[PDB]
Symmetry: C6
């Protein structure tokens, strides 16, 4: 985070012990369940790339994921370098140097420069850009660490329909399917993978049935 | 949440780790008991649509319920578009745009626009409007996840009357009864579903008996 | 709660997660023991009717008690309406309870000159309805609190004045019971010692005597 | 507690949920061990009589002690009335205890020139009444604290001065007991060593000698 | 602690429930292990004598140590009176907080020049606590000997833990690396340590016996 | 930490009890796992040398590590003295470590123009000394991390890059081992698949291949 002191100068505020401990415990408890990504975006709110690396470094295990996270950050950093060229004009007084991909990731940039890009006019939100790469790389990890595929989620003979749909849309969240696929799967794979008792009831409802009606029907 | 900084500018303050952890743990412990809904309204006090989505996304399980919650949000968003039409023509620079249904849900609107609408005179409470849609969709989930119907709540032979009334008005809360239906059932289903020993005492009290007198009578 | 922001405007501040969790856990743990009422009044300090309903609604179980609490709130609301006819607008009984009044209106009445403490009025009704619940949920009657043969006198007096608190006896009755029902319901060994002390004996001297 | 708001007006701020929960848990865990009194004085720092009653009312059990505590508060209130006749109004004994005085009046007396600290006066009565409870609830007397044959001297002295704190001994007795009752109640092995040290021995030298 | 209010007036702020509970639990858990002294100095940072006595009084057990702590406070108070004959000038009993109000203590602390009665009194408490830690140390440094199968890392943890409670100088701790640490090692690690020769850091010694 | 008071004067603010307890527990729980170092750099944010010593002194066990940490601090202090002769006074090595410098001087150097970041310089020495400890306390060598017969490849890579982190390998060494030692130490089933992928394979493609 960044704060303006009484002098009007933009200074780096330290990340609190509650936030650091919160981020450590959720990774310890939830590993890489899909809800970890919204929790990371919440705890790292308004953070600099320096603060984002602090939170990533504090994670103890899961170094296979962290090494993959670095590779995704390197790929996004090289993509930034390509389509943002480094202009040959002399650096205007009071304006900062143009942010490079490695500067946004925080490897080759100081904390003062990061505050400079974030607070100057126009602002270059290197914190938000870098967090976009991290969440992007974390989504890939969640997709890989997902144990079951959506095609294998089939309802049991005695399993309640409510529990089956919980597993179905849990798997669909880890596989990071689009929202339209999630809405579409209601009338396609969800009915197909149901047991013969619920499937007969679901087909009788016909097309265009909301999930509310489908769970009421198999109750 | 929103805060007025030292300059007097309305800035978005981070949702605290205490609030986030509180909302996560209540969903883990209480699932979808009726008291979860007041807890959400309390924890999400003064939140932007961005903050409401943060709280909803951090929920780990119950993806069947969350998928139904999305459908109810889409239905309320489309209803907003119907009776508040928006002329989405190109708007002059610096001019607040009229809130669309998807803007209230937070999918197609920035965090700055949401603060703009909320801290306006007169205020356009996109945070409160969106919370109304969420609680509306949450009440439907509680009704569905309610296991027993009010008609099946019958007092046992040796069960104390106090415990039976605890179960009765708990079931009646999940089934989302009106206050008049809850007040009226005191002289209808509560007496009818009582055991023969207490029912004889309750009929002797006659009409117009408060719940206080009924519980004293069967003690 | 209510706060004055930097601008000088009276704004509603959100009830903290600590208070909400504190009030939920004490109802979960203590149910309706007499010490829950002072805990409620303490946690709901300076609250609007909106905040009071939030704390009451967050209670999970005990819906029999909450339904009785509504009836006591409705009875007090009609009594307010009878004593205050309706011609900022003057608060109606349902406005004090928070059913037919906005959060801005409640802040208006509380931060007015002269102030109309709708929060304190409504909390007075809530504590009133909660006291009836504590009396009802009291398991034993004060007449049934009798000291055991091997029970220490200290424990018997702990049970005695605990029951007397749930039955909502007056402070004067509580002071008076020291020489009447407390001595009468004691076991024979301590009762002989208590009568030897005579009239006008403090509880300090009584518990020292049966030690 | 009391706070000066933005306007400069002294307003009552609510006691925090941390403080209330802290005071509840210590009474549940420690009952009436001597350290509960300094814990009470710390948590109730700068409190009004209203806040002191809030903390006292939130205590769940120990109603025998709470009933004795009321009697000590009444006795100190009557002593105040005798030394201070009643003609801002002058605070009477029942006003200091907080039964017959509003929260605004209590703020008036505390934030006055010259200040009448009814909060500190009432806390002095409470701590006085609580010390009587700790003195009574002490299980063993100082004369019965004797060192075992195999008990280490360190543990015996821990028990000795723990009892002496609950028995609310004076500072002089605590210093003096080092050379009298601490040596007298020691076991024959340590007592022989303690007498060899002679007069005027600090507790440091006595515990080093029996190590 | 002390705070400057909105008016600019120095008022005493209440010690927080977190701090009090923190100080109570560390004494319950750690008893009088050497790290309790720095924990006390940190939690009682900027405290008045009134606040220091609040923290000392809240300790439940260990009244033998607390009684010894009182005697050391009395001895240091008499030493202050001998060097300083008698705003009023603070006497020894005023620094300990027995014969001085909370307003006087704030007066001395927020004075020009400041009379740090809080820092002076904390120096006496830490001094008396150091004596307690030295006494409550169970083993002597001479009895800390490495086992036959004990790892060298664990032996050095015990060695310098004992050496901390026995309150050895910083120089004594550094010098013992090649003297008593090697002498009290097992014959397998001792042979390795002597081969390293003089002037070996603790890093090289633990790598050698790994 | 350092704060600017209302007057504009730079004063030292107390290290919070949350921070102190956080740093103590992570050392109790994690000992000297590699993630302890970023946790230390985060908890000691903006701290003076006095505050850094407070955090180091509060550590209870691991005195073997703390004694080695002192030796590394002494070595870096002597290196500072060699590169900076001593003629506000200029900070010497022992002043940066905080042994021979007051808290006011440390604030003087830190809050000055130009700033002499004695807090950041001293923290650089501590993290340097902690990195040496983590390398020593690492149990297994990278050469011994071999995948089992039935072990999933994901778990083997977790162990591999955990060991590689404690040994404080460079980023290039971590990147290079993906196609070198990680493939060599895999089991015969996964190694056959990994060689078939050929050169230039990311870790993502390797873990998908052995799934």
């Amino acid at each position: 985070p960044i704060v303006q002191n009484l002098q009007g100068q933009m200074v780096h505020q330290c990340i609190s012990p509650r936030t650091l401990n919160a981020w450590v415990k959720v990774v310890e408890e939830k590993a890489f369940s899909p809800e970890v990504i919204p929790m990371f975006s919440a705890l790292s709110c308004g953070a600099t790339p320096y603060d984002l690396n602090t939170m990533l470094n504090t994670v103890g295990g899961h170094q296979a994921a962290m090494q993959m996270l670095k590779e995704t950050i390197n790929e996004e950093a090289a993509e930034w370098d390509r389509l943002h060229p480094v202009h040959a004009g002399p650096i205007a007084p009071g304006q900062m140097r143009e942010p490079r991909g490695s500067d946004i990731a925080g490897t080759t940039s100081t904390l003062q420069e990061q505050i400079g890009w974030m607070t100057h006019n126009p602002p270059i939100p290197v914190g938000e850009i870098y967090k976009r790469w991290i969440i992007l790389g974390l989504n890939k990890i969640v997709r890989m660490y997902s144990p079951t595929s959506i095609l294998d989620i089939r309802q049991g003979p005695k399993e309640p329909f409510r529990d089956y749909v919980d597993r179905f849309y849990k798997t669909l969240r880890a596989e990071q399917a689009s929202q339209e696929v999630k809405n579409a799967a209601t009338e396609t794979l969800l009915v197909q993978n149901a047991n013969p008792d619920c499937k007969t009831i679901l087909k009788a409802l016909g097309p265009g049935a909301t999930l509310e009606e489908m769970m009421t029907a198999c109750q």
